Design a protein around this ligand. Structure first.
Ligand SMILES: Cc1cc2nc3c(=O)[nH]c(=O)nc-3n(C[C@H](O)[C@H](O)[C@H](O)COP(=O)(O)O)c2cc1C
Ligand SMILES: CCCCCCCCO[C@@H]1O[C@H](CO)[C@@H](O)[C@H](O)[C@H]1O
Length: 364
């Protein structure tokens, strides 16, 4: 754990250690309005011994939402709710980035004001569910809907929404933003060949499939500066329905594209739930050459594997998702080898403080 507990520079920030709390949707936002709130501020502040917190995905617009009760980042009230979170986290000595979210086709009309979802194409995500508010207090799991293909004007609108969301994140006191371009969501629906059947400049070729990513990143950087922009990618997981035919080429190219933009970090989502594909070390080393900023990995890491990934030169920082839900003091536990509590799946999403802020710190 020695390297894990070394500080690191992230742009203008000096971070305390190499541990990341990655984005974790908890579906706790206040209703009406999808507003980040008090229990969320406590929850994040409890976990501020991380070197970096990345917020749960926060939708950039009404039609960017995939799941019931996720917090937005587009209304004044939403910005203010996030400000209480960032104030709480900063009072603990910690950096926090907002994960800007557009789910594309991974949604249901019930979550997007009755609208049809949008995507690169008209392809439904196969074997994917989201959840909606069915009036009860538990999430209602539902099949996703068939999307409509984005027009040029839709592309411009979504870019504008991302750009503004980045400014809104700065107004909310975040230290930066993370673009969610992973786990089968909108940008990923353009990147991955089998999800993109466009015949315009946003599909077919590799250059074309990376174009939407390129243009979104350019707008984010123009708005808030490259030192405040991270990006999340999922080269090899396919759980939410996006498959690429040549992911080593596509994602090495994506990494090099992002390197050109000088984004402050690249975050690889190596596992999504139970989807834990073989991610060859040779490929990780290629990503390390293609992108020369801070490289973050998350997915089924423990203390041993995290330390090894850093010492092998594969990663600079490591995120721990599920363990951070149940262990607010995860860094201390990893450092000492204290046993980790396990999380309760039934309280991941929705509800209140139970299963959110009532996981204790370690006590022998
Ligand atoms: C409850 C839960 C919610 C999640 N929601 C998001 C999210 O909002 N954005 C995201 O990029 N990943 C999300 N993820 C994925 C995690 O960031 C992480 O990559 C994944 O859980 C693998 O890491 P782990 O094995 O350490 O949990 C979520 C994971 C969990 C368990
Ligand atoms: C009862 C708890 C059910 C846990 C099973 C999780 C259902 C899907 O969970 C979803 O996973 C996505 C990544 O695939 C995330 O981006 C979303 O934030 C999350 O809501």
């Amino acid at each position: 754990x020695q390297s894990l507990f070394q500080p690191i520079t992230l742009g203008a920030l000096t971070l305390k250690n190499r541990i990341v709390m990655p984005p974790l949707t908890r579906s706790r936002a206040s209703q009406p309005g999808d507003v980040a709130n008090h229990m969320m501020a406590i929850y994040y502040a409890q976990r501020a011994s991380a070197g970096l917190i990345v917020s749960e995905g926060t939708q950039i617009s009404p039609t960017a939402k995939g799941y019931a009760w996720t917090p937005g980042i587009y209304t004044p009230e939403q910005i203010a709710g996030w400000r209480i979170v960032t104030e709480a986290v900063h009072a603990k000595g910690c950096a926090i980035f907002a994960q800007l979210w557009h789910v594309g086709r991974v949604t249901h009309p019930d979550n997007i004001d009755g609208q049809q979802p949008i995507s690169s194409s008209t392809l439904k995500a196969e074997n994917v569910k989201v959840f909606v508010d069915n009036g009860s207090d538990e999430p209602g799991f539902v099949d996703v809907a068939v999307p409509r293909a984005m027009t040029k004007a839709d592309i411009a609108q979504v870019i504008a929404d991302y750009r503004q969301a980045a400014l809104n994140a700065m107004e909310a006191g975040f230290d930066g933003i993370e673009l969610h371009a992973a786990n089968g969501y909108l940008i990923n629906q353009f990147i991955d060949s089998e999800a993109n059947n466009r015949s315009d400049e946003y599909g077919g070729s590799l250059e074309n499939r990376l174009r939407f990513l390129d243009e979104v990143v350019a707008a984010l950087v123009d708005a808030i500066g490259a030192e405040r922009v991270g990006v999340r990618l999922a080269p090899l997981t396919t759980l939410n329905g996006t498959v690429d035919a040549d992911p080593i080429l596509t994602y090495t190219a994506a990494a090099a594209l992002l390197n050109k933009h000088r984004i402050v970090y690249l975050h690889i989502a190596e596992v999504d739930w139970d989807d834990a594909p073989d991610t060859p070390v040779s490929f990780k080393r290629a990503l390390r050459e293609a992108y020369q900023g801070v490289l973050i990995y998350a997915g089924r890491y423990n203390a041993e594997k995290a330390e090894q990934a850093i010492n092998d030169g594969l990663a600079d920082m490591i995120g721990f998702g599920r363990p951070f839900i149940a262990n607010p003091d995860l860094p201390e536990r990893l450092r000492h080898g204290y046993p980790l509590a396990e999380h309760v799946p039934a309280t991941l999403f929705g509800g209140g403080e139970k299963g959110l802020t009532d996981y204790p710190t370690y006590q022998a």
